[PDB]
Design a protein around this ligand. Structure first.
Ligand code: NI
Ligand code: NI
Ligand code: NI
Lengths: 136, 136, 136
């Protein structure tokens, strides 16, 4: 508690991603690992879900993750694991097609499945874990 | 498998948290990272859910997490990521109000959402990841 | 981004586990931590769920995880955290009985609960996190 190295622990916060609607940080950097909170397809300015259903929500959620990554000195190539929570399993393929446009190489490990309900009636919510570079 | 440092890996076990009802440890410390098993609002002495519904269950689950943290040389300030699994999304705000009483600063990254069912008919289950200090 | 050590980041890929059905890697090794994608009870050769329901699916999912671990220089003793996603909470005990045959000591931290639906109509999906040895 004093006998080992003191590791970085930094709260990541950017107005380019939505404000919190509960007692949480957008992301936490600890040592070099970044835990990103689950992101809905929420407009950063209004705090409400973007219109147009699951495809548009997925694009916005991933955009939000990208801005949090950038605030933490990373990009999508630093992501090592993601979780995609769906309101409808039948949206699996369509959300995958959005996802692949952001995660273009060194693809993260992943789980994707249908939950009973998301906050605000979201159709998709995406969590991620990243590691600060350099990565060989 | 012998050419790198041998990292600490320690099973965390305290009678101040409930006994296992399956093949799992309360938590695992590996290097400085602590993975805590999902905690229901179970009374540590009886192994049954405390009465009074989701608010009381959330308080008990977080109390249980606190005792596991303490057994691992940590407190709630060491938590970096939590997951709150709900039986009912409409309980989001009320569980947040309990949660904020324990996680009072450096708030963890978080995801919270409704699943189809929890063991024992629990109304809430909370998982967490912590990192042993010092943290700067 | 150049001022710290360059950590290993390696995509784990083995034909002894099923091919991807989306934009993801079977596992990612980053430093010494291995994030394994969620595994259904899919036959590695055919890419379809094995017959016989949840018990047989759980055995196949864990077999698949074991082959991914082996490709990453690990075995089941390196696992520190697992998540068991069920189509039916009433299968909790039966899946635990399969799980315990693979995870025989130093049991991982765990969460297990029922989701609304899994890809392909799977009855069980298992994710895991491991750390490369040596572990003391
Ligand atoms: Ni110390
Ligand atoms: Ni070695
Ligand atoms: Ni650098």
């Amino acid at each position: 508690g004093s006998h080992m190295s003191s590791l970085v622990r930094r709260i990541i916060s950017t107005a380019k991603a939505p404000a919190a609607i509960g007692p949480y940080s957008q992301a936490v950097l600890v040592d070099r690992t970044i835990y990103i909170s689950g992101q809905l397809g929420m407009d950063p300015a209004s705090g409400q879900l973007v219109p147009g259903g699951v495809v548009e929500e997925a694009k916005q959620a991933l955009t939000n993750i990208g801005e949090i990554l950038k605030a933490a000195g990373c990009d999508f190539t630093n992501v090592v694991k993601a979780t995609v929570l769906l309101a409808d399993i039948n949206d699996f393929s369509a959300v995958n097609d959005v996802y692949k446009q952001y995660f273009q190489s060194s693809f993260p490990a992943k789980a994707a499945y249908q939950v009973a309900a998301l906050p605000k009636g979201g159709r998709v919510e995406i969590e991620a874990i990243a590691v600060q570079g350099p990565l060989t």
